[PDB]
Ligand code: HEM
């Protein structure tokens with residue numbers, strides 16, 4: 001039994017390792033994890049209680065590069081080889097993807113005990129929004145925060161928002177250097193300049209109120225830019241680095257939330273709390289069901305998060321709407337005729353109810369969100385082992401699950417000719433979304449119990465979006481006015497750009513320029 005002499009040579013070998021020249025040591029510090037990673041994958045591949053794991057060369061990094069550049073093309077290749085459930089390594093994390101409607105069910109309807117959104121997202125959002133809200137709090141708090149925000153998102157609220165949003169659009173056409181319709185009949189714009197600007201102007205005026213919109217006409221607007229630059233997927237890896245980008249971000253968060261808090265405290269002092277905006281609403285309705293009240297700081301931080309999330313999804317979407325219509329004068333013409341019919345040649349004022357009578361306009365939004373889901377991947381951290389039904393698979397705690405309704409939006413099996421933009425695929429189905437059957441309430445209102453729809457621009461289950469009707473209201477007013485006021489087209493040789501999958505939303509790669517011209521060159525915008 002010469003295991004003793006073998007154990008002596010183990011200790012001897014461990015000693016001889018340290019006497020290697022330093023280059024051989026570093027070389028061994030690199031070659032040994034690499035070889036072990038390959039060996040580990042080969043062994044892992046033997047497992048039958050695990051989904052197939054995408055092979056990768058660089059330890060820790062995994063498939064990060066190819067996933068980040070072209071996630072849908074990555075998914076399609078993986079789907080061909082391995083089917084609908086497969087894992088990949090992403091910067092030290094194991095991501096289990098479940099494609100298609102069954103994956104929507106597996107992730108969006110997973111048990112609260114099994115998965116955690118806030119554990120996946122906290123580092124992404126908390127340094128931008130501030131503490132105590134959205135993902136920096138337990139799920140039950142998030143549920144009620146969504147309930148609070150929904151209280152300012154009623155039909156009656158949208159009826160008041162429409163003329164406010166319309167006013168802001170017309171003001172932008174009049175005053176922005178990108179347009180100046182009283183002085184120019186044609187111009188060239190970068191839609192990733194105009195649309196983020198129009199989106200924050202319209203959303204601040206309606207959700208935040210006249211005071212906070214007024215602020216955007218000052219140097220305070222630079223704080224919003226500074227905060228917007230902090231809203232980036234780099235926060236997943238580097239939420240805080242001692243650089244200037246980060247300190248500009250933190251400073252802006254303090255100053256913007258400070259501005260909101262100043263208005264909040266001034267309103268309470270003056271007893272000036274009406275039903276004007278989301279701030280009024282949160283001042284009157286922000287008590288959790290255990291009787292704890294949101295602080296003024298948490299109210300402000302929630303306002304930041306709502307406005308920032310709504311900012312990126314909606315600005316990206318109206319950019320894509322403009323870009324797809326720039327090569328589709330037929331759609332512009334069809335939309336214009338609908339406007340003339342619904343609004344009696346323009347003699348009728350746009351109202352929230354009339355927006356509902358504009359199916360083609362709404363189908364255009366719907367179809368843009370099919371082809372351009374602003375969020376290509378949604379994440380949950382796995383908290384308890386999950387059995388994948390009808391498989392032998394178990395997804396262990398410490399893994400992440402990734403769901404991608406945006407991938408299914410682009411599958412021919414569910415949307416024939418899925419890479420053609422065609423608003424008429426939605427004829428007699430112009431609703432922003434539809435609960436086909438039974439409903440459930442997680443704390444913010446009854447929503448569809450099933451999430452099997454191949455079309456889920458707004459997600460589903462407890463984390464489902466509550467801004468869908470605001471987004472359609474905002475996008476609808478904005479596009480109604482764009483269509484009635486302008487025609488637009490591409491400069492020669494340009495077409496729809498491909499998306500940027502490394503940004504917070506799948507926005508178009510730039511510079512994405514269109515040329516506009518006034519339908520009525522003599523139309524003037526008053527005020
Ligand atoms: C076209 C516009 C929009 C799209 C496509 C969209 C999409 C989504 C999606 C897919 C989710 C689910 C996220 C997940 O499961 O991880 C979500 C959540 C949410 N969205 Fe939106 N959104 C849009 C606009 C807005 C707007 C305008 C607001 C606010 C006014 C908003 C506020 C929220 C909130 C509060 C949540 C809940 C997050 C959670 O429960 O974890 N969204 N949105």
Ligand SMILES: O=C(NC[C@](O)(Cn1cncn1)c1ccc(F)cc1F)c1ccc(-c2ccc(OC(F)(F)F)cc2)cc1
Nearest residue numbers: 067068134233305306308309310313377465501502503504
């Ligand atoms: O903002 C994100 N998720 C919060 C969000 O739901 C966004 N949102 C939804 N509705 C409106 N905004 C949210 C909810 C409530 C709020 F109040 C504020 C919010 F903001 C998100 C952003 C980027 C990625 C992402 C993932 C992978 C990726 O690819 C990679 F890794 F870079 F390669 C790129 C981006 C995922 C989620």
Ligand SMILES: CCCCCCCCCCCCO[C@@H]1O[C@H](CO)[C@@H](O[C@H]2O[C@H](CO)[C@@H](O)[C@H](O)[C@H]2O)[C@H](O)[C@H]1O
Nearest residue numbers: 151152153154156157160274275276277278279280281
């Ligand atoms: C015969 C004539 C008389 C018939 C009666 C007609 C009643 C008309 C009143 C309709 C009610 C709408 O009036 C009021 O609108 C505001 C929006 O401005 C809604 O307000 C809602 O949105 C605002 C703004 O986001 C939030 O601040 C607020 O917390 C929320 O409740 C009120 O909830 C609603 O009560």
